[PDB]
Amino acid sequence: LSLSAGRPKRPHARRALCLLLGPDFFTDVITIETADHARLQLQLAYNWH
Amino acid sequence: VRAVIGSTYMLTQDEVLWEKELPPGVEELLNKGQDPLADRGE
Numbered sequence: 001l002s003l004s005a006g007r008p009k010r011p012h013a014r015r016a017l018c019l020l021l022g023p024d025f026f027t028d029v030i031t032i033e034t035a036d037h038a039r040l041q042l043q044l045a046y047n048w049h
Numbered sequence: 050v051r052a053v054i055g056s057t058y059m060l061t062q063d064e065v066l067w068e069k070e071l072p073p074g075v076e077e078l079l080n081k082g083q084d085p086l087a088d089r090g091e
Contacts, residue, residue, distance in 0.1 A: 002086040012090035 023049040 005014040008029045025048065031041040050067040060066070071079075081088065 002090055012087050015086070 021049065023047065 001016040001019060002012050003014045003016050004011045005026075009026075025045050027043065027045045029041060029043055031039065033039045
């Protein structure tokens with residue numbers, strides 16, 4: 001499994017021989033923009049399983 | 050020319066090994082396809 005990892009989650013930055021399927025999280029940095037045209041980045045964390 | 054596949058084999062009388070030839074670039078794709086992961090990525 002060629003998987004994604006990194007800060008803003010660049011692709012193909014990790015290789016896995018097994019699939020992690022337990023309750024865990026991975027964090028991402030998301031740049032968005034409001035209706036006032038003010039740009040502001042975020043830091044999130046996605047609890048998954 | 051045929052393909053004998055399976056058990057161990059001794060070429061009898063009137064048999065010789067036939068080479069199979071491939072188009073250009075197929076041979077470079079046969080061996081890369083064992084794990085072409087990152088190539089498939091980008």
